[PDB]
Design a protein around this ligand. Structure first.
Ligand SMILES: [Cl-]
Ligand SMILES: [Cl-]
Ligand SMILES: [K+]
Ligand code: NA
Length: 164
């Protein structure tokens, strides 16, 4: 397991524009295109991202290219965020992946709003952090995925993903 395998499980792979769990146009391996309700706006974003006129459809290689960009950018962003970098630096490489997963799903601002959970993680109060992470819109709206991420933070193992 690694971050790519983890997020591939959590996000799936679809080569045609689809709506994510929030109803937003997405493609590939959880590549959010736009929050606009306009399919045409989403198609435009897609073409801009790929560099060709895609008409809503991409190849696996193109999906993987966007996915690597999105992970790379998630990590670079964590490291530039004063609210996230200290907790990230305090963690082991498996728990890094849990934090990158959250940022991938909800964006930096959203994760930086988990102030109390992040403190408990920094403190290595793992069971307490796990309880606190679950007190969230995130856990209510995507409980199975949140449980996997939270187990990863709680245990520092891949137990929630090894078997999928
Ligand atoms: Cl709640
Ligand atoms: Cl879920
Ligand atoms: K295709
Ligand atoms: Na998805």
């Amino acid at each position: 397991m690694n971050i790519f395998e983890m997020l591939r499980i959590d996000e799936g792979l679809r080569l045609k524009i689809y709506k994510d769990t929030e109803g937003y146009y997405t493609i590939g391996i959880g590549h959010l295109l736009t929050k606009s309700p306009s399919l045409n706006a989403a198609k435009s974003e897609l073409d801009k991202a790929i560099g060709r006129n895609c008409n809503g459809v991409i190849t696996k290689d193109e999906a993987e290219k966007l996915f690597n960009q999105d992970v790379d950018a998630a990590v670079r962003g964590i490291l530039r965020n004063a609210k996230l970098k200290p907790v990230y630096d305090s963690l082991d490489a498996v728990r890094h992946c849990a934090l990158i997963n959250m940022v991938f799903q909800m964006g930096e601002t959203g994760v930086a709003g988990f102030t109390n959970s992040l403190r408990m993680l920094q403190q290595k109060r793992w069971d307490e952090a796990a309880v606190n992470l679950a007190k969230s819109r995130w856990y209510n709206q995507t409980p199975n995925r949140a449980k996997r991420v939270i187990t990863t933070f709680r245990t520092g193992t891949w137990d929630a993903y090894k078997n999928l």
